[PDB]
Subunit: 161 residues, 8 copies
Amino acid sequence: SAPVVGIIMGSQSDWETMRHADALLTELEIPHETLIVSADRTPDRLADYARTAAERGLNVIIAGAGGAAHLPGMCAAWTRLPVLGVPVESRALKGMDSLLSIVQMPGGVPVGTLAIGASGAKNAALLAASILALYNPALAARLETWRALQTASVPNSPITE
Amino acid sequence: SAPVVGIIMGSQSDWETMRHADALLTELEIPHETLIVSADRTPDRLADYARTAAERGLNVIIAGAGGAAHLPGMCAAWTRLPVLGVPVESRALKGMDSLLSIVQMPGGVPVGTLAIGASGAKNAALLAASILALYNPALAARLETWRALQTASVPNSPI
Amino acid sequence: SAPVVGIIMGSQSDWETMRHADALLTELEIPHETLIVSADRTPDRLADYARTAAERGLNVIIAGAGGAAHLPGMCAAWTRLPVLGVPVESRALKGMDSLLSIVQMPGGVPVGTLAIGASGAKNAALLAASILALYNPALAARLETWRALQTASVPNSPITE
Amino acid sequence: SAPVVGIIMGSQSDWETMRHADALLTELEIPHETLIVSADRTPDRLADYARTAAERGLNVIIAGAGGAAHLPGMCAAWTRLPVLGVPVESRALKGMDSLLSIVQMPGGVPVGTLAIGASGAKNAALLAASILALYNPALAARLETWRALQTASVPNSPI
Amino acid sequence: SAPVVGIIMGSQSDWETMRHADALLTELEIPHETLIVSADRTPDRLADYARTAAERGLNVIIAGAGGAAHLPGMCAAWTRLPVLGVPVESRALKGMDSLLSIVQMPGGVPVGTLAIGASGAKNAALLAASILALYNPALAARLETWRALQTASVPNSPITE
Amino acid sequence: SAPVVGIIMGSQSDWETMRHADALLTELEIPHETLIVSADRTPDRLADYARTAAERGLNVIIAGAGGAAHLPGMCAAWTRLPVLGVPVESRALKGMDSLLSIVQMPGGVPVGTLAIGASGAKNAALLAASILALYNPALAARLETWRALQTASVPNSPI
Amino acid sequence: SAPVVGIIMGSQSDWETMRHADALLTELEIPHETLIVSADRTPDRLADYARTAAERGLNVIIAGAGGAAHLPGMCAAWTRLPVLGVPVESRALKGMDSLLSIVQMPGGVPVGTLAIGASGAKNAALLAASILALYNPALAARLETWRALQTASVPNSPITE
Amino acid sequence: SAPVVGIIMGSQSDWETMRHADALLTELEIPHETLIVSADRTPDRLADYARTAAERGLNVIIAGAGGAAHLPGMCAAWTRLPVLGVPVESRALKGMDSLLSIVQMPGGVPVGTLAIGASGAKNAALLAASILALYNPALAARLETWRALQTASVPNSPI
Ligand SMILES: Nc1cncn1[C@@H]1O[C@H](COP(=O)(O)O)[C@@H](O)[C@H]1O
Ligand SMILES: Nc1cncn1[C@@H]1O[C@H](COP(=O)(O)O)[C@@H](O)[C@H]1O
Ligand SMILES: Nc1cncn1[C@@H]1O[C@H](COP(=O)(O)O)[C@@H](O)[C@H]1O
Ligand SMILES: Nc1cncn1[C@@H]1O[C@H](COP(=O)(O)O)[C@@H](O)[C@H]1O
């Protein structure tokens, strides 16, 4: 019942992307919370959120943001938990600013970064699931079934119009 | 004593970078194995490595390569374990090729990607440690010490 | 009758692009097969496909994929045949990730890479045809006619609205 | 005597770049402090620095960092003071990561961004001076001299 | 009543972007002027505008332009005032040419550069306000209220469709 | 004895890169010719080279150049033979210009493009060999040996 | 009456861009020809076109192409005349491939390169006019009038919606 | 004897690049002047230079600069003469900033742009020569010789 993953994002505009992480965690029956935390507009909210995450029982944080994306990195600055970062696609630079802002963390403070956009959001949830699966055999079985099914569902030839 | 993290790299020329992940795991006393596995030159070696990793008791795989860096993604394709990707700085394109080749995985098969180069190698080991810390209280305490020491050690002013 | 080129692609979404390779091979009367093989979702299918390609009588593989595109490279890892890679245009990064993921193969395992998108797909078929033409005089004549006609069909001035 | 500009930088390795901002402020006789504050390694040090800057009588903050450079943006998040950002040239991506990480702030929290590297460090100090000059006539005159000397000193032909 | 900020832009096409700077200065009750000055088409107009800005009572210049954007840099060449530059998004290169053309000023002639597009325009006004706030306590209070309200208005969770 | 692969390059400064294609063809005992042909400085030399290549009994052309690299594309324009393109690493843009100039051929005139630099030169020769192997069983066996040795030689762990 | 500028382009698809060069030359009363010449599909047509340009009385060549754009460079390889290159915007890479393919000519064979797209086409005509103006006083007066008018037609403030 | 080409550059640090344009003009016996004019540090020097260029009998201006390279565009803004732009290779971004800052001129004010670095400097001088050749038959013949010698001198095979 209690959340074991936190999904955080910098704004409502990030939800179109971050919803894919939420949906996948629900699919895999992983209890989680989904919040807006702005690194730029609510820095003390972020400090408190990240500092207290482990004691609140969270095991993984998925953080999504675009542009000069500081949310995942600053979350990782304050938590000892693994933080996974989703680069949200930006208007002009198509998430290249998002990506570099997230992935290029200095040695000492990791962010596990996924692909730009919805694929990255979905993969952040799957990566979070694979982490939790290491010490939750029920989840590990559900993940195995999920991966096996993905493999089995790939067609052999295209629908050629 | 038995490895719980596998560090794999596409070639000897990646060692200068991946040694930083090795050093960090050793500092934190995390049993690990350190291997050369090339997605493109040794594809069956990779298939067997990745397929058997969980049975062997590995919990996290750290995979580094440069150029068109297929090693992390293909590893993730064959294992259910978390795979962390280190883009090795390439000669021409300075790891931008490595970075895009690794991070841009389609939905369904994740690679947790870290920075280009030595920083990313170190951070992949730290990220692996933070994952292992979730169910190893002694290591969690050692990782807390490591992070606390990092923070406390930053000078207040430049020399 | 038996296929001498294999066209493979990572997903149905690649078909809009890869159809151009299929169409050109048909135009030149080159027997071929057209399949979906996912490097990420069906890695053992790919290993078996690429490992057995030469013994099944294939001479050239055209492989198309986008994003972090591993399909052409991993195909080449397992076959001694020439593998030609088509970078499928991606949403955010416009096929730049596709291109670099395909073309930047390490020394030892080649992928002959074509342009991003439909042009690359068509050129992969033409390149495949030029390879087969070296030891198939009927095809060589058809290719010569095809190239000659392309040259002859270029107008001398634009239709100026 | 009390500092009116704070120069902060993510680490010692930024000093080679940020020293140019320090030198310029000193040349123009602008009292300033020069500190290492890491957004990612010392986040609470940064929070306290940025939150208290105005109370302490700082007017402008110059912040430099490389890579995923969060220092200027996070500083701006906690202060009402103008924050100027210097992208430090990174090893792999030559400060393109630093530049995008700094300049691409969403509406609401500004960072005035300067060029990558030493040029940008110098220009952040000059920009801070032009801001201070608005309400300090003696400094305004010294800045006018500095700019006049820069212009007058350019040779007419190459050696 | 007399303007203390000048907003200048290279063309009418820049207004869609630069209007956001105008609107914010008005919101904060900062008297300003809003003009078209073309570095390429009206270089002597620019020289005169920038040279006389301080004596006309301006304290900050916000300059917006796209493509090979010379307006902010050339403005700074002629004024001792702080000049803030807004990179206007360009058609092909999405404001990357704008950004590099503005931000990469040589040591000696600063331009304080903001984000590509509308966000940068709004931030240029906010940065200008923060500068003026240093010696205008009424404005400083309005800015504090403005920032505080932005912080307070961030929701705690997304509207999940 | 008569060449079946032509290696052409835009200038002497490409040799440091293109020599790797030469070495590989020689290792595999593939008769070849190695020439300097500049699309831009010797356009008629190129026209004649490319137009006559098939008559002369060439089967594959490997063409390398840097910068705005027109050599492979223009070669392909005049021959029906497969043309493989090697982007030579340029000074400023590190072969990104070379790469785009070569790979981005419009539909109708193909260039099979390989990686930037020495890797790409080696791979163009390997790709040419894999093409020739389709109708030369002795060479096919030698290429199989080469690939087998590459795979088998990869160490299991770094030094 | 006889053309003094040649405008050449690789295909009909380039005309949407290259029409702007044609229109400007007509505006300035510069006699010119406008043709399709494909470097990739009609290389011998290009060789003959470029080799004979000076003897046919042409003074400047404007060449437009996109993607891996070889037309301007190969034109310059064969003519001693000044060749100006227009990078036509490409689909995926937005004319970055066009630009680098044109501008990055090796020392020894120049192409004077203009901006990506319609602006570059118009500027190539203006650059061509400025070249011809050096030895044609009537044209020089028309160009002076044209530049003066451009300067005079810039508004002083935006139409603020 | 009176200059018909002006070479201008943003600073002394551009000379290493712009000297190649100077050498070429001298080789072809084209009278020219070679000056430092900074758009940003000496804007009025530039205004006067560019405004008076035609009166002084200049026919072509070659302008080189690096970084946010405003010199060619602003020169073109004040003169009716053809302006050719040389992007000088910058430290961080390797002249990509220089290139975009120069080539991306909006319709109405052209800059004929050449390659980044020494190549571009040489080519700007060659382009200026090809322009002057249109109405100077002696120079046209010398340029024909230069181009003929370039073509004829390319070796047939690498050393
Ligand atoms: N992508 C790839 C596949 N197999 C090896 N590599 C990469 O090739 C680069 C150069 O390796 P080498 O020196 O062996 O050619 C290294 O970064 C290595 O990961
Ligand atoms: N982004 C960031 C956060 N904390 C430090 N950095 C940057 O990390 C780079 C390398 O620092 P170091 O040598 O300490 O690892 C410097 O540019 C420094 O600003
Ligand atoms: N693009 C091109 C056309 N002709 C030569 N080049 C390239 O120019 C580069 C530099 O050559 P050089 O030293 O002769 O100027 C080389 O990569 C060569 O292929
Ligand atoms: N963009 C610009 C304006 N004024 C000078 N520059 C450029 O600044 C670079 C570095 O010059 P310096 O060493 O004087 O700082 C040179 O490429 C010079 O053209």
